[PDB]
Design a protein around this ligand. Structure first.
Ligand code: GNP
Ligand code: FV4
Ligand code: MG
Ligand code: NA
Lengths: 469, 167, 166
């Protein structure tokens, strides 16, 4: 038969399942809704482990339970009473013999030890992957240290001592590759001559590589804490989502820089060379699976100042028109082709983050926090699972590093790019549009001629890499 | 076959804008949503006895990608310009959204509706009359909606379709 | 995208976690933090086909030895890991092999035998002895180093091919 359980009066996690406290979806069960007590029971269940559930729960629980309360509940879960001796044990003891204690030994082996180990696994995952709770609440960290540091008994000892050390390391807190990265490529600007760095003087291959390293690092820095609760949209977004906002602001700045390079090149022939170079950079972004970079370029080419430049468009080579068209088609029909391509490539890649943001926000906004059943309010856990499916996808693409060498001067050049200067956004984008009208006026105004501004060769070195010995 | 209308929702972030399309497209009567499922943003409707397909673009959450606005707006035939009735800044943002739409579409007469959205029980700071006056100065309809009761939601989208049909 | 459920099993300290983290993050973990149960995901193209690997990293410490049926039921294929400088971990392999067969009620479970820590000179399990065992199981034997990456992709992606051809 099944093991007997402690009385629900002394141990709250032994209450029977009912539709008043847990609802399952239609081979482990998937929880649709439940009380916090039932969620924590299933988080630390004696019959099976559920590492996905641990990640989902630790990512999303603050929408229904405070960190201090979670710790109290898992400590309560850990403190399981042992059963009293059975009749057979009693009779042995009365005869001066040692009891077999068969039921007690089974309950220790099959209930207490798995539940306690799974509580410790929650603690371990909490500290390793969601340490911000403890960074933001020093008293919570003290309580966790005290709980772990006072667990007795040899069965848990290896993990107790390990978790103690992990906590201490987290308080005061290297890549290997299958091959060598390719050689850094140089064009007109030579190494160390940062004052000449520009769109046409850096090698287009190396522009795309260094922007991909930068954008990959920005992508990889975004933690789920910046996303759950839609906090990047709220009044404290600069406090709660700084890495996400830094990533988005880089993307915006690069798009505006591409637009500024185009419309400030007043000579038609030179502006064609600028646009052609940008589409070559886009080609390398595609080769590197840097989808953020691909869309940075597409957004610039679809912007109001650039889109209308028909005289420039007319001179772009047909093959480059095709490259830009197939990049734009990734975004059509609500990113249908982008989503399929992301799911087919071999990482490393740099996803476009905006789709994730919209899907997290709409999942949060479009589903209720609780479900009302039989007069009880149950936590709607399916909504949280959906959010954590998105944060899990994000994290999956954050693991793989690019095998490309950093060029510190090129990296600094793009880190410090500031196309808007001291201008406000409206002032600057009006300026870009007025430049567009200046260099290619609306019909029937005649097309003016403008002097060249670049003194160096406009011919691209191309985007196929070179390899000396 | 039936006409498809590409509608675009624009407006300030962080003030419940997304509830407009969610409530429309929703199982009206089951408060639930998976935005990831292909065609959680397409809805077949009958407006004045004529069946059509609404394809709604709502990039709520991407407001900080400000250089993508042109790219997203370019896809649309008609626009819902949404502000929150308890957020005066979102109302003051409307003028620049409208100017940007006119620029992207290269037209002074783009089908659009002004939508005042009640997203919580916090005190209203934009009165109906202020928003009506603004809409009239633009020559466009004004619809107020609730983010919780679905009131006004069908009126907002159907009014926009009528603006497109009568353009 | 086909999804593959891989499970990494073997005695405590043989490098199951270091192997997995090397595969996932290209990083070698120097610390020995005993696992309870961890899970990872990896999108990767193998033989021209994109798939999604779900990798379960399990507990090798004997104190967790009564909690294995539950993960063996879910797994499609198993990396059976020992360390080539630890003869006891090699002797523990057959206990994992037999338990997997019992739980899945099958003589034909996708498996790869992995001899880890092959960067270390002081070997105590000879390749021939491990290869003989692998042949008796009908499975390949791959020596790996979580430290240097030697053989790591080969071990995991060979297991994927086994599941695919099962
Ligand atoms: N030299 C060398 N050391 C390794 C290698 N793989 C793991 N180690 C080291 O061996 C120790 C144990 O590694 P770990 O991955 O934690 O082993 P495990 O099998 O997951 N242990 P457990 O079963 O307790 O979870 C660590 O100190 C780790 O750095 C390897 O290939 N070479
Ligand atoms: C190659 C190129 C395209 C465009 C702008 N553009 C165009 N236009 C529309 C208006 N007439 C000319 C074609 N179609 C595009 C499709 C996708 C994208 Cl992303 C941008 C698109 C503008 C410049 C200066 C240019 F060189
Ligand atoms: Mg381990
Ligand atoms: Na206000």
């Amino acid at each position: 038969g099944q093991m007997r359980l402690p009385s629900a009066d002394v141990y709250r996690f032994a209450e029977p399942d009912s539709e008043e406290n847990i609802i399952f979806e239609e081979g482990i069960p998937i929880i649709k809704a439940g009380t916090v007590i039932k969620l924590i029971e299933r988080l630390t269940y004696h019959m099976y482990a559920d590492p996905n559930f641990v990640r989902t729960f630790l990512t999303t629980y603050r929408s229904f339970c405070k960190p201090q309360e979670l710790l109290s509940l898992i400590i309560e879960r850990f403190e399981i009473p042992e059963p009293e001796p059975t009749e057979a044990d009693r009779i042995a003891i009365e005869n001066g013999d040692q009891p077999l204690s068969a039921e007690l030994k089974r309950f220790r082996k099959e209930y207490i030890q798995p539940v306690q180990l799974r509580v410790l696994n929650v603690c371990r995952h909490w500290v390793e992957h969601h340490f911000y709770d403890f960074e933001r609440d020093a008293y919570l960290l003290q309580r966790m240290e005290e709980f772990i540091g006072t667990v007795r008994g040899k069965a848990m000892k290896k993990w107790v001592e390990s978790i103690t050390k992990i906590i201490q390391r987290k308080k005061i807190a290297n890549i290997t590759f299958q091959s060598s990265p390719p050689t850094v490529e140089w064009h007109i600007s030579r190494p160390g001559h940062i004052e000449t760095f520009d769109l046409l003087t850096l090698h287009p291959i190396e522009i795309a590589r260094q922007l991909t390293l930068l954008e990959s690092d920005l992508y990889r820095a975004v933690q789920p804490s910046e996303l759950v609760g839609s906090v990047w949209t709220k009044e404290d977004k600069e406090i709660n989502s700084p890495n996400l906002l830094k990533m988005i602001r880089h993307t915006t700045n690069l798009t505006l820089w591409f637009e500024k390079c185009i419309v400030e090149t007043e000579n038609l022939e030179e502006r064609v060379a600028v646009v052609s170079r940008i589409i070559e950079i886009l080609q390398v972004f595609q080769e590197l699976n840097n989808f953020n970079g691909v869309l940075e370029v597409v957004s610039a080419m679809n912007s109001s100042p650039v889109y209308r430049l028909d005289h420039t468009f007319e001179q772009i080579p047909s093959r480059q028109k095709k490259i830009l068209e197939e990049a734009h088609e990734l975004s059509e029909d609500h990113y249908k082709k982008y989503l399929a391509k992301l799911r087919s490539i071999n990482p490393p890649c740099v996803p476009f983050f905006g789709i994730y943001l919209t899907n997290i926000l709409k999942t949060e906004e479009g589903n209720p926090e609780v479900l009302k059943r039989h007069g009880k309010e149950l936590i709607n856990f399916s909504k949280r699972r959906k959010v954590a499916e998105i944060t899990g996808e994000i994290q999956q693409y954050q693991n793989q590093p690019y095998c490309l060498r950093v060029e510190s001067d090129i990296k600094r050049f793009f880190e410090n790019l500031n196309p808007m200067g001291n201008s406000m956004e409206k002032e600057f984008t009006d300026y870009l549009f007025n430049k567009s009208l200046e260099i290619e006026p609306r019909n029937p105004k005649p097309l003016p001629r403008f002097p060249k501004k670049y003194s160096y060769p406009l011919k691209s070195p191309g985007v196929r890499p070179s390899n000396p010995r | 076959g039936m006409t498809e209308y590409k509608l675009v929702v624009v407006g300030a972030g962080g003030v419940g804008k997304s509830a407009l399309t969610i409530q429309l497209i929703q199982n009206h009567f089951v408060d639930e949503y998976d935005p990831t499922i292909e065609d959680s943003y397409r809805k077949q409707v009958v407006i004045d006895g004529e069946t059509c397909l609404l394809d709604i673009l709502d990039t709520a959450g991407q407001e900080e990608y400000s250089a993508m606005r042109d790219q997203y707006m370019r896809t649309g035939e008609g626009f819902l310009c949404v502000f929150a009735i308890n957020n005066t800044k979102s109302f003051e943002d409307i003028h620049q959204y409208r100017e940007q739409i006119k620029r992207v579409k290269d037209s002074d007469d783009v089908p659009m509706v002004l939508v005042g959205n009640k997203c919580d029980l916090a005190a209203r700071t934009v009165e109906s009359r202020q928003a009506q006056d603004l809409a009239r100065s633009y020559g466009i309809p004004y619809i107020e909606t609730s983010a919780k009761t679905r009131q006004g939601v069908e009126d907002a989208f159907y009014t926009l379709v009528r603006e497109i049909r009568q353009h």
